[model samples]
Target: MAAKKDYYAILGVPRNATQEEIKRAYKRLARQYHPDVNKSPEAEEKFKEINEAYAVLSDPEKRRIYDTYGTTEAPPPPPPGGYDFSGFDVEDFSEFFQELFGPGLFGGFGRRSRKG
Candidate 1:
């Protein structure tokens, strides 16, 4: 498999950046390369790249694994029978973060939210 992209490099931030720093970096890059805002041929590609980076880095668990393991080997997969959904709802997490933080911090570009 190909090496994973350096998310911090992609967002122009340091490896030890805090969550707030990552959010700021992502927001800056996202605005610069957003397809709707920038029409350059490479704008869409850069936008997607930054978005993917943010998705990984914004999540604490995934960020920790990525930072520790780099991309040489696949990290352990999710629990065997799939994730337990007993008290977990993706939407709940989404709303919780959006409310506690902000939608842009999570890179919720296409979600039907006024914040984005």
Candidate 2:
């Protein structure tokens, strides 16, 4: 696979750019390259790049790791059976998803059904 692009560069911001700066860059790029707005063959690729950059850089922990590691491989996966989640409630998991992706995406009435 091709090497992952540097998200900071994709967004046209320095590594030390503030959160507001990152958000501003993302908004500007998203508008310019959104598939619906720009039909160029490269537009989709640019949009995906911007989204991936925003996903990591917008989160504090992931941003910290990316900054310090600079493309280092992630640590080995946790050992099997070390992460039992039998006690985790469905509602708690749902809430976590809501926090990450926005409440309405997974919380609407139809989402309560298994068909989704």
Candidate 3:
């Protein structure tokens, strides 16, 4: 299996980044890859990843859990039409995002634990 993705590395921020710093980083990336703004096919995927990283990192609680556990949960499926910012808060992951990762989503990374 491939190495697990690091949320901090995804956002290009340090583990100790402040909430405001994380927000700024998220906004910049979000806009840069907002499909309407970025025509690159890869931008959409990158945008999705940026949102996922921000969804975990922007929340203090999730961030804490990730910092302690080395991962939070599997990310939600992307919207078929692409993301709609529509005055949405960066802090709010869709109910879809929340529900999708809500439970039974950590199976892939379970083996990270040491048995010794």
Most lDDT-accurate candidate: 3
* Backbone collision tally, model 2: 0
Model 1: what TM-score? 0.59
Writing each residue's lDDT as its tens digit, candidate 2 over 9-84 gives: 8888887778889988889999999777998878876676676677656756556644544422534222333322
Q: Which clashing pairs does model 2 show?
A: none
Estimate the TM-score of every prediction: 0.59, 0.57, 0.58
lDDT of 3 by residue, 5-115 (tens): 566787888888888888888988888998788889889767766787777776787676445443325443434333333443332443334333432232234556553
Clashing residue pairs in candidate 3 (N, C-alpha, C atoms within 3 angstroms): none
Quality of model 1 by C-alpha lDDT = 0.58
Each model's C-alpha lDDT?
A: 0.58, 0.57, 0.60
lDDT of 2 at 88: 22
Error of 1 at 46 (Å): 0.5
Query: How far is 62's C-alpha from truth in model 1 (Å)?
Result: 1.6
Per-residue lDDT tens digits for candidate 1, residues 24-113, read 888999899876788897887677667656765676765765555533254543333333223222223332222222323334456574
